[PDB]
Amino acid sequence: LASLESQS
Amino acid sequence: RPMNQLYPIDLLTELPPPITDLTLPPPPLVIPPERMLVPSELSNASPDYIRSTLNAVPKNSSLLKKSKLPFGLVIRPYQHLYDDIDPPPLNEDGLIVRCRRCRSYMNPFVTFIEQGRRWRCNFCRLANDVPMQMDQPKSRYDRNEIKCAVMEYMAPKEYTLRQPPPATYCFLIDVSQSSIKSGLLATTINTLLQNLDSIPNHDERTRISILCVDNAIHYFKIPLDSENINMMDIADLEEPNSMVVSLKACRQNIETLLTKIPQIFQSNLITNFALGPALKSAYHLIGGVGGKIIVVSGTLPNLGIGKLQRDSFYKNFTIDCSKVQITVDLFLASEDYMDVASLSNLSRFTAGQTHFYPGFSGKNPNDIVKFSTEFAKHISMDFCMETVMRARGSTGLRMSRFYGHFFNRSSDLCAFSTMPRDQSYLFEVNVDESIMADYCYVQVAVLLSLNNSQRRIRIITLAMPTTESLAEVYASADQLAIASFYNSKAVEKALNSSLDDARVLINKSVQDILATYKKEIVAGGAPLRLCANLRMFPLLMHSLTKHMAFRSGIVPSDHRASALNNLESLPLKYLIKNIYPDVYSLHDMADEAGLPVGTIVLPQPINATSSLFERYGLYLIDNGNELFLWMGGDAVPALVFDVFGTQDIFDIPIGKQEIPVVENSEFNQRVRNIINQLRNHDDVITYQSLYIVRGASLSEPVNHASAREVATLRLWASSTLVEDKILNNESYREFLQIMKARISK
Ligand SMILES: [Zn+2]
Numbered sequence: 019l020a021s022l023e024s025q026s
Numbered sequence: 027r028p029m030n031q032l033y034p035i036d037l038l039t040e041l042p043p044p045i046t047d048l049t050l051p052p053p054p055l056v057i058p059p060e061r062m063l064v065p066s067e068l069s070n071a072s073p074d075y076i077r078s079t080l081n082a083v084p085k086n087s088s089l090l091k092k093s094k095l096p097f098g099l100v101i102r103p104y105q106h107l108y109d110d111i112d113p114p115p116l117n118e119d120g121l122i123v124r125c126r127r128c129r130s131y132m133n134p135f136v137t138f139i140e141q142g143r144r145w146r147c148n149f150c151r152l153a154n155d156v157p158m159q160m161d162q163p164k165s166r167y168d169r170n171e172i173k174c175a176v177m178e179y180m181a182p183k184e185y186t187l188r189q190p191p192p193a194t195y196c197f198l199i200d201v202s203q204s205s206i207k208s209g210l211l212a213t214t215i216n217t218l219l220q221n222l223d224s225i226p227n228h229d230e231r232t233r234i235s236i237l238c239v240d241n242a243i244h245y246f247k248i249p250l251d252s253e254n255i256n257m258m259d260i261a262d263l264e265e266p267n268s269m270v271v272s273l274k275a276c277r278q279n280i281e282t283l284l285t286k287i288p289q290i291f292q293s294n295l296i297t298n299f300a301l302g303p304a305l306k307s308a309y310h311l312i313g314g315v316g317g318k319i320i321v322v323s324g325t326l327p328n329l330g331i332g333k334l335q336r337d338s339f340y341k342n343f344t345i346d347c348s349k350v351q352i353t354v355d356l357f358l359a360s361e362d363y364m365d366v367a368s369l370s371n372l373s374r375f376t377a378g379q380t381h382f383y384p385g386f387s388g389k390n391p392n393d394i395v396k397f398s399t400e401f402a403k404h405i406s407m408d409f410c411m412e413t414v415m416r417a418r419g420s421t422g423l424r425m426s427r428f429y430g431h432f433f434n435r436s437s438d439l440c441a442f443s444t445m446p447r448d449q450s451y452l453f454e455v456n457v458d459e460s461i462m463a464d465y466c467y468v469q470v471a472v473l474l475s476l477n478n479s480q481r482r483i484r485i486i487t488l489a490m491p492t493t494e495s496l497a498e499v500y501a502s503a504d505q506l507a508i509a510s511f512y513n514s515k516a517v518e519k520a521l522n523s524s525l526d527d528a529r530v531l532i533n534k535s536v537q538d539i540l541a542t543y544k545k546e547i548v549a550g551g552a553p554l555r556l557c558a559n560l561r562m563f564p565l566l567m568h569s570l571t572k573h574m575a576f577r578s579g580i581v582p583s584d585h586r587a588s589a590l591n592n593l594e595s596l597p598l599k600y601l602i603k604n605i606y607p608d609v610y611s612l613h614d615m616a617d618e619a620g621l622p623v624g625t626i627v628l629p630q631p632i633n634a635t636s637s638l639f640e641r642y643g644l645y646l647i648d649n650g651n652e653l654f655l656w657m658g659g660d661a662v663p664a665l666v667f668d669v670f671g672t673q674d675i676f677d678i679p680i681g682k683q684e685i686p687v688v689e690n691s692e693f694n695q696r697v698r699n700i701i702n703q704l705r706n707h708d709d710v711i712t713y714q715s716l717y718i719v720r721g722a723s724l725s726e727p728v729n730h731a732s733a734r735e736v737a738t739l740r741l742w743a744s745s746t747l748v749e750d751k752i753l754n755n756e757s758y759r760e761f762l763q764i765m766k767a768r769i770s771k
Contacts, residue, residue, distance in 0.1 A: 019414045020439040022185050023473040024129050 028056050029493065030082065030501040035561060036553035037762055042633040042749065047562045048602055052504040053081050056491045061465060062134050064173045069134045071175040071488035073504075076101050076470060077598065078455075078490055079511055082502030085492040086460040092546065093499045094538040097455040098511040099417065100598050103472050103484060104447045106709050109408045114484065115170040117179040121159050122483070123171065127152045130418050130469050132171040133487040142166070148467055148489075149420040175488065181481035185473060191351075191411050192231035193477040194270060194317030196308045201238040201291040202299045204325040209388025210359050210397075212288055214322050217398045219284050224406040227273055228478040234280060235270040235311055238287060241298035241329055243307045245269060251278045255286055263303040263330040269311055299325040302332025302339055305372075309343075309352065316351030316411055318378070318444055322401075324360035324386060327369075334365050344375035348433040351412050353378040353444040355404070358584075359386035359397055367587035377413075377432045377442040379449065379595065381711075382588040392682050396713045403711035410474035413442040417453050420467040427454035429514040431595055445474060448710050449595040452514050461492050496546050500557050506602055509566040513601060516576060517594045529571050529578065536567045541769040554766045568761045569606045569634075569748040579753060596650075600710060604650040607634050607746055612644035612697065613665055620696020626703035635749040635758075641721060644669070646697075647746050648704050653716045654743040655685065655697075659723030668693040676727060679718050680736060719743045 030053045052073055059065035077100040084090040090097060105112060123132035128150040135148040138156070145154050160166045170177040197218070205211045225232060238244040247256040247268040252275070273280065301323070308319040332339040347354065355378040358364040370380040381400060386393050415432070416439050417425045428434045430451035433441040440451075455468070470486040493499060512535045520528040543556050556564075574581055575589035596604060608631045619629040632638050632645075639645055642661055647654040657666070663673035668691045670678050679686070685701065688694035705714055719739040729736075744752070751757040756764065 019187075019412060019441070019473060020416070020437065022187065023414050023416055023439070023471060025124065025184070026129060 027058060027491070029491065029495075029498050030054060030056060032497045032501045032547070033558035035556060035558050036550075037556055037561070037564065038554050038766070040561065041759055041762075042635060043565050043758070044561065045606070045631060045633055048506070048606065052077060052507065053502040053559050055081050055489065056502075057465070057489050061489065063136070063138075064134065064167055066173065068174050068176075071486050074102065074105055075176050075486045076468075076488050077504055077507040078468070078488065079504055079507045080499060080502060081490055081504060082493045082498045083461070083466050083490045084457060084499055085494045087457050089494060089496065089499070090457050092542070093496060094542040095499060095503050096508060096511045097457065098507065099453040099455060099468065099470075100507050100510050101415075101417070101451045101453060101470055101486070102597055103415065103445065103470075103486075107403065107407045107447050107711070108708070109476075111708060113178075115174055115177045117170050117177065120180060120182045121157065122179055122182065123157060123160065125150065125152055125154055128418060131471065131483075131485050131487070133469065133485070134172060134175055135465070135467055135487065135489050148465075149418060149469065151421065171485070176486050178485070179483040181473070181483050185483065186475070186481045190475045190479040190481055191315045191317070192229065192233050192479070193226055193409070193411070194233045194235070194312050194315060195225065195405070196235040196237065196270070196312055196317060196319045198237045198239060198304050198308050198319055198321040200240075200299050200321075200323035200325055201244065201287070201294060202240045202325045203294050203297050204360060204362065205323070206291060206294055208324050208360060208386055209394070210322065210324045210386060211291065213388060213394050213398055214401065215284050215288055217401050218405075219281065221402045221405060222273065222277070222281065224402060225273065226406070226408050226477050230274050231479060232273045232477075233270050233317075234273050235308070236283065237304055237308055237311075238291065239299060239301070239304040240291065240294060240296040241300060243300065243304050246283055248276045248279050248283065250275045255283055257290070260307070263300055266311065266314075297325070298329040299323060299327055300330035301327035303330040305332070305343060305354075309346070309350075312352060313350040316443060318353045318355060318409075320355040320357070320405070322357040322359070323364075324358070324362075326362065326364055334368060336363055337368060340368065340372050341375070344372060344433070347376045347443060348441060351443040352376065353442075356380040357383070357397070357401060359383035361385050361387060364584055366584045366591065370587055370591045374431050374591070375433055377444055377446065379431065379446060380588075380591050382584060384585060384588075390682065392684065392715060396715050399713035400711045403713075407447050407711070408477055409447065410442065410445040410476055413445040413472060413474040415440045415442065415445075415451075415470065415472045417468055417470045419455060420461075420463075422457055422459045422461040423466055423468065424456045424458055425453050426456045428452075429518070429594065445472070448597070450597040450601070452510060454511075464492050465489055466492055500543065500547070501559060503557075503560055505560050505563045505566070506598060508560075509563060509570075509605070510598055510601060512567060513570060513593055513605070516570065517590055520576065521590060525576060526578075528576050532567045532571050532576065536564045537765060537768055539563065540765050544769055552766070554762060564762065564765065565758060566602065566605055568758055572745070572748045572752060572755055573605055578755065592651075597709065600650050603648065606748060607647050607649040609634050609747070610646045610648075610700070611638070612646055612700075614643070615696070620693075620699045626699045628700055628703060633749055634747045636744065636747050639721070641723075646700065647743065648714070649746050650712070651714065653701065653704060653714045654746065655716060655718045656743055657718075657720060659721035659726065667691075669697060675720065675723075676729075678720055680720065680732065681739065682715050682717050684716055685718070717743065
């Protein structure tokens with residue numbers, strides 16, 4: 019879900 | 027600029043210590059109105075959400091290493107058990123302005139350049155394009171992200187992979203024999219029964235499940251109330267619909283079941299509790315969407331995988347949980363060994379919590395009260411799911427360590443399968459490259475799924491001045507934050523190295539500082555110098571060493587682990603009180619004290635030393651865990667009367683018991699008043715039991731049985747006054763002297 023928080 | 031100034035003091039001249047400082051706000055955050063787009067108090071982050079150990083950040087590494095002051099962040103995303111209380115401003119339009127490179131969020135510290143067409147990121151100075159959407163009767167400057175440091179957003183579709191989950195609860199209950207006789211089962215059932223409407227159900231979707239466990243795992247199928255018991259046993263310990271049901275759609279049935287349970291295992295003679303297998307059962311029961319497995323027990327795991335003796339299967343369980351967003355809560359209640367040191371790892375690494383009830387026994391009407399209250403408040407607590415928290419730092423700042431309950435392996439990202447409301451956290455910050463600007467910043471972000479089927483993002487942006495002046499670094503140090511930092515370092519040193527190492531570490535934190543201030547800052551005699559804003563640090567670290575979590579001497583394994591678990595997750599305000607107690611002088615209480623202003627007025631606190639305990643006075647101690655009502659042995663029959671009804675002080679209630687209501691005694695009402703005020707908190711579930719202790723008189727009579735029971739109280743209560751010499755540990759006065767001796771030549 020870091021993928022989502024970073025929105026990179 | 028208005029940089030906070032150094033206020034030199036002599037610690038040796040402040041005894042007893044000015045304990046009123048424990049309640050002062052940290053040093054100011056010196057930021058002029060220009061650095062802020064919309065200058066207001068709300069423009070910079072409040073200390074209630076985030077507190078830096080340093081509010082005047084060293085402008086480079088060499089200066090930070092020289093200060094010997096740690097750089098950390100006490101972070102507390104939520105402020106109350108229920109979200110409807112004092113929430114931050116909420117954004118709904120869906121516009122989320124974020125820097126293309128660092129990915130930080132739009133905040134009060136960005137700068138609009140070139141006709142406000144593009145914004146310069148305050149974290150990485152990149153030039154970003156201002157969405158034209160940022161100007162749709164209000165302007166861009168009426169938007170929370172630009173007005174507030176602490177605000178929230180309604181996350182767009184691209185911040186969710188799957189649809190927000192329903193709050194799901196699985197109660198893994200111990201129906202073994204130890205649980206029947208202690209009454210833990212009854213108390214647990216009754217409490218669920220009395221609070222099925224206290225459980226959060228903001229979207230009518232909350233789902234519940236129930237597992238009773240002894241040597242086998244007992245399930246239950248629950249029909250919709252509309253279509254009007256089924257117990258499914260499973261002894262194969264090597265081994266959905268209607269198991270995890272809608273609290274609303276099956277309310278009566280859930281109630282009907284809960285009422286029967288106690289009858290079922292009523293004559294249970296089995297002493298087994300297959301926690302491990304039960305956990306896996308619960309796991310498969312909710313792994314689909316994720317949720318909370320809440321365990322209640324008073325019997326050490328003794329069957330199946332995970333059994334313990336007077337492990338590491340759990341540590342693997344937590345890793346699996348991180349995969350399916352599951353959190354584990356533990357309520358351990360019994361007179362027998364429960365190995366909290368080991369079970370606490372379940373909660374610890376899943377973002378949950380562990381609560382231990384030493385000596386629990388339904389035979390004591392007061393035991394039930396504590397467990398029941400805390401349990402109820404616990405299940406009434408709001409929480410998030412699929413949450414992840416990250417702290418970004420401006421150029422030069424790096425988050426290195428992360429403390430508190432949650433899952434974190436090799437990232438700067440902390441995962442909360444569910445994020446509770448009652449805990450606190452801490453991030454260690456490093457300064458790598460030298461900072462060029464006169465300000466550095468830290469932005470905490472929380473990508474969460476609330477228990478209302480909503481996806482949100484909570485942001486906390488903090489701005490701090492930079493400085494090359496050591497003096498300035500010190501003048502802006504947050505003693506309570508710093509104390510917190512070392513508290514965590516201590517829990518790590520212990521839970522990983524050794525208790526003694528911990529003490530050694532705690533005492534050094536104080537030495538390094540006292541030594542550093544001395545040599546790096548510049549008439550008198552021989553004082554112990556330090557600035558006013560750090561004037562409580564030595565006392566706290568010293569006091570910390572006497573805490574049940576770090577004490578030298580004997581401390582039962584469970585109590586020690588419990589103490590350590592609590593200290594590491596408690597909110598700053600409650601951590602300081604757990605280390606240093608609020609003590610109240612009641613017999614000479616002010617007339618307002620004890621009565622409202624429905625909030626009661628409390629007396630001013632007195633230092634934590636028995637030097638103030640006159641032998642004819644009344645004192646009340648609050649250490650955050652319990653309350654101690656100490657009545658001097660030489661109490662005048664009049665006082666003894668106003669409080670317990672009798673004039674005979676040797677007739678007083680002893681031990682864990684409440685104060686009786688003495689009608690036509692305003693004083694008895696004021697005491698009982700203060701007690702209940704100390705019990706009301708909307709940010710923690712803690713229910714503080716009362717222990718009534720009788721001091722010693724000059725003419726103390728014969729009661730050999732009690733003598734034993736009572737010596738234990740006077741001892742326990744005595745050990746709370748952390749300023750006194752206790753056993754092989756020196757007084758605070760001496761502690762200070764010893765330090766002067768060490769930082770000298
Ligand atoms: Zn940036």
